[PDB]
Structure 1
Amino acid sequence: GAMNSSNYAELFNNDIKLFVDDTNVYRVTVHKTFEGNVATKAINGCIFTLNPKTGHLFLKIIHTSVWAGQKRLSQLAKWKTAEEVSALVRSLPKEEQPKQIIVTRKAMLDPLEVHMLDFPNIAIRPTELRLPFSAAMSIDKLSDVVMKATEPQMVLFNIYDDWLDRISSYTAFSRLTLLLRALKTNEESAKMILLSDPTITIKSYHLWPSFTDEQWITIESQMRDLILTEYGRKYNV
């Protein structure tokens, strides 16, 4: 069924599973027209499909042309997501296909179930966790590839960089969700923390800086301070 705090270690067992987040599929700017009405302009989007055990991220870039001439775009976006996830699964060898797909928003359940009718043994599940995957577009290199795309495109990343060489999946996921929660709560401050020290760089083939174990502990503490700080600024505490 649904995924929550009681069955959290399931994410790091040896059953292949993917998180799917559709928040950033249909993205718009709202603006005034010359007549003083309001209109939207779509911008490029992405599906965030993540294996939490391996860090493998399948980033399907959603180019604005896919919305041309379409109606009810927020509803279409869920079905377009489901179509693209189904196409990804079919593209994978059988032994790489997930046994479960966890959607971050319950409105993806029916679209994905319908698109996956050919895969009755793949479990489609919601989650009670409030995961911060909408902040994926605050990772500069992911935002860059999405905005530069002139056509539909799939790009593959490891969102853990090389962390699994030193830490377990569970810890790597906890670090990722802390970073993304911070970027979501106060992006400027979070990026400042991540880049304040120019001696620590981001490798060309990585998304995050090359922190030592000690530096990651310091980074992680600063991110919790930021999150607590914002929580205080927000609620006056």
Structure 2
Amino acid sequence: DDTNVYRVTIHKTFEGNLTTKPINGAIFIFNPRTGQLFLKIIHTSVWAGQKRLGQLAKWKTAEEVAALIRSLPVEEQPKQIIVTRKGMLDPLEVHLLDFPNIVIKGSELQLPFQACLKVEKFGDLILKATEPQMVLFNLYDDWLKTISSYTAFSRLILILRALHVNNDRAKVILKPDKTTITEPHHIWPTLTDEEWIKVEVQLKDLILADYGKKNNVNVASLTQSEIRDIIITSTTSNYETQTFSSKTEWRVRAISAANLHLRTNHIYVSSDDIKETGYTYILPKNVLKKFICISDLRAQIAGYLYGVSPPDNPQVKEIRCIVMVPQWGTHQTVHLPGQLPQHEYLKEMEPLGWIHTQPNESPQLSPQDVTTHAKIMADNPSWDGEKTIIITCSFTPGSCTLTAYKLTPSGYEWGRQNTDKGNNPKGYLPSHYERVQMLLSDRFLGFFMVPAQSSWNYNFMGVRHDPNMKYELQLANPKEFYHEVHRPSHFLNFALLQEGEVYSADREDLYA
């Protein structure tokens, strides 16, 4: 949002002069996925002595934003970035020429960032800054461990619209009394989930009452669409731009997978509250490096874990086998078949769950992955629910981070009741995930499985993938996602004449 770059303080109640004073500017950049908000401060000293502020400013927005985007890893890229006031885009593209693949688009509704700039600590610290600086903060605070980014973004947007509409009403609604303490890291005031729900309902009723009082209409007689909207350019409905490319867009993924071997030397492990009751996941570093090198930066990869427990140690579970099925990956999920891997060599071993990759870093189990784990646990009577876990290896920026989730039985029932596949579906609960003991293993070496008559990387050929399809397994190394055997359609895209080989048919080589 570039609307906060140029601003001035308006004051003068008494002695009707209606004057103004210069104030420091700001830049609001927030990501709704991770809830992080990047704020940049602009000193007033730079305002004086510069003519044509309007032009100067608008050009100064996409400038520092391009450096902030270029100062972050490719995993933190803005991906599908959008602006505020439908106007600026040109500047953005220009500054981000270096990375033209990032799409630029406007916004359907205005984001109330003035309420975020009107906060007590935010406004005092922004007005008290004597030098330009870049500060980062998270608007979700501790709500990330309870509700997903959809509910957190909805409640944060409701508190933002309520704080922007009325400062006194939302200010009194956000302060129950004087019992809610405020952390230095926790942006919003500490409050129970029920208190945040009641405060969210009071904020929605305050915004609806403000809009109804401003438009002189009864808020109780409004419909659902009118309440959602309150909370010739008719045939230009956006512009669905080019999807894939299989030429340069897949080449960027193949080059990122080519640098995945260089990023395989830095790995992280999930450290959380150990209840000391579950088994300890021991996975080999070689299979982890192979899964990190064989994955992609856009398509999610997945696999099945198989292993056994060591003798006289029930609290440890060594993973010694990784099973790969022919499937195709999506941007937020992976279209994996429901066929269970069965073989004569796996008759003496046991399935230890599943292992999937995550291109986006989120501190929770994915809802589609939780639904897939629930469907795998329900359809397989031999596979136990407590014995199977989903080791989600998230794609860290410039590194690797593995996370381990366990399924609560109430959470498993909530995931089985959850049928929707959206980003904020019904039936999703944060209590469905549970941390388990997981670490790397160097004393035990695992093995990788391969399909019998096909490959495991079937993302480039989605038409041959079926959930009811049957396939066998073998003990071999699977190919890469961008391999020539994994993508026959990219090698078959060749339109050339056969008469071109007749020209220059001189076979003079003179070498054996």
Where on the TM-score scale, by shorter chain, does this alignment land: which range?
A: 0.7 to 0.9
The CA distance in 1 between the partners of 2:53 and 2:144, in whole Å, is 38
Alignment correspondent of 1:199: 179
TM-superposed deviation, 1:39? 6.9
Alpha-carbon separation, structure 2, partners of 1:38 and 1:224: 34
Question: How far is the alpha carbon of 1:74 from its aligned partner?
Answer: 2.5
Q: Report the TM-score, using the length of structure 1 for normalisation.
A: 0.84
Q: 1:219 aligns with which of 190, 194, 199?
A: 199
60, 67, 75: which one aligns with 1:87: 67
- Aligned residue for 1:9? none
* Per-residue deviation, 1:31: 7.5
Unaligned runs of 5+ in 1: 1-20
What secondary structure is seen at the aligned counterpart in 2 of 1:59? Answer: strand
Quick one: which amino acid aligns to residue 22 of structure 2? A
C-alpha distance in structure 2 between counterparts of 1:76 and 1:178, whole Å: 33
Aligned equivalents of 1:138, 1:154: Cα separation in 2: 18
1:178 equivalent to 2:158? Answer: yes
- One-letter amino acid of the counterpart of residue 83, structure 2: V
Q: Residues 90-122 of structure 1, C-alpha deviation per residue, up to 9 Å, x if partnerless?
A: 111222222222101122211212211111111
Where in structure 2 are the equivalents of 1:61-100 lying within 5 Å? 61-100=41-80
SS in 2 for 1:57: strand
Match of 1:127 in 2: 107
Give CA deviations for 1:131-185 in whole Å, capped at 9, x if unaligned.
2223211222221221111011011100111111100001111111100100111
CA distance in 1, matches of 2:27, 2:69: 14
From 1, 8, 15, the counterpart of 1:28: 8
In the alignment, does 2:121 pair up with 1:141?
A: yes
Task: Summarize the Cα distance change of 1:223–1:30 in structure 2 as closer, same or farther, 3 Å threshold.
Answer: closer
| Aligned equivalents of 2:33, 2:121: Cα separation in 1 | 22
* Secondary structure class of the residue paired with 2:89: helix
The answer on 1:109 being equivalent to 2:89 is yes
The Cα offsets for residues 49-68 of structure 1, whole Å up to 9 and x where unpaired, read as 01111111110011112222
| CA distance in 2: counterparts of 1:24 and 1:164, whole angstroms | 27
- The equivalent residue for 2:144 is 164
CA distance in 2, matches of 1:72, 1:38: 23
Letter in 2 for 1:91: S
Distance 2:11 2:178 in 1: 38
| Aligned position for 2:36 | 56
Gaps (5+ residues) in structure 2? Answer: 218-512
Structure 1 residue 30: Cα displacement: 5.2
The code of the aligned residue for 1:55 comes to G
SS at match of 1:108: coil
What do you get for the CA RMSD once the two structures are aligned? 2.0
SS in 1 for 2:154: helix
TM-score scaled by length of structure 2: 0.40
Larger relative contact order (CA 8 Å, sep ≥ 6):
1
| Equivalent residue number for residue 13 of structure 1 | none
| Residue number in structure 2 paired with 1:11 | none
Aligned partners of 1:222 and 1:109: how far apart in 2?
Answer: 37
Deviations 1:10-62 (A, max 9, x none): xxxxxxxxxxx112111113579xxx998753211211101111111110011
- In the other structure, the counterpart of 1:16 is none
Contact 2:85 2:110 in 1 (8 A): no
SS of residue in 1 equivalent to 2:4: coil
Max Rg structure: 2
- Is the 2:87–2:106 contact (alpha carbons within 8 Å) kept by the matching residues of 1? no
Q: Is the 2:89–2:105 contact (alpha carbons within 8 Å) kept by the matching residues of 1?
A: yes
Residues 79 and 112 in structure 1, CA contact (< 8 A), matched pair in contact too:
no
Q: Which of the two has greater helix per residue?
A: 1
Aligned counterpart, 1:44: 24
Shifted more, 129-138 versus 164-173: the winner is 129-138
Q: Give the partner amino acid of 1:52.
A: P
- Matched residue type, 1:87: A
Please tell me whether the aligned partners of residues 10 and 21 of structure 2 are also in contact (alpha carbons under 8 angstroms): yes
CA distance in 2, matches of 1:159, 1:78: 26
SS in structure 2 at match of 1:61: strand
Identity of aligned residues (%): 70
2:169 aligned partner: 189
Q: What amino acid is the match of 2:66?
A: S
